[PDB]
Amino acid sequence: SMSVKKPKRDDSKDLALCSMILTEMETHEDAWPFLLPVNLKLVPGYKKVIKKPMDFSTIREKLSSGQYPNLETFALDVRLVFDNCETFNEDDSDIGRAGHNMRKYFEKKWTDTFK
């Protein structure tokens, strides 16, 4: 409360460490469905169904330009990419499986880096 604060967690490396995580997601072999925004002219259904499209290139631009106020808003956009993928793709599809694999990969790196 006023003039009463929990000890200051060092967040000065969060920007760099989120960038490294995102590099590793970018270079994973199953990243290909997620590298670029879904083309909303060419994928029937996507625009109406997926209210907040997100992809790795868009996270990368947001990160590089100071649009994440903290490391949690960054994790929310990463998770959004996989939530969207599950919303639109059958579990038993190449893209569906890719999404599950990448989410697992992300959550491990996240825990190991920050928890």
Curated annotation (Swiss-Prot):
Q: In which tissues is it expressed?
A: Expressed at varying levels in several tissues, whereas a smaller transcript was expressed specifically in testis.
Top-level taxon of the source organism: Eukaryota
The record's subcellular locations are:
Nucleus
Residue span(s) of domain Bromo: 9-113
Family that this chain belongs to? Belongs to the WAL family.
- Report the function annotation for this chain: Regulatory subunit of the ATP-dependent BRF-1 and BRF-5 ISWI chromatin remodeling complexes, which form ordered nucleosome arrays on chromatin and facilitate access to DNA during DNA-templated processes such as DNA replication, transcription, and repair. Both complexes regulate the spacing of nucleosomes along the chromatin and have the ability to slide mononucleosomes to the center of a DNA template. The BRF-1 ISWI chromatin remodeling complex has a lower ATP hydrolysis rate than the BRF-5 ISWI chromatin remodeling complex.
Assembly behavior: Component of the BRF-1 ISWI chromatin remodeling complex, at least composed of SMARCA1 and BAZ2B, which regulates the spacing of histone octamers on the DNA template to facilitate access to DNA. Within the BRF-1 ISWI chromatin remodeling complex interacts with SMARCA1; the interaction is direct. Component of the BRF-5 ISWI chromatin remodeling complex, at least composed of SMARCA5/SNF2H and BAZ2B, which regulates the spacing of histone octamers on the DNA template to facilitate access to DNA.
The protein's name: Bromodomain adjacent to zinc finger domain protein 2B
Record organism:
Homo sapiens (Human)
Lineage of the native species? Eukaryota, Metazoa, Chordata, Craniata, Vertebrata
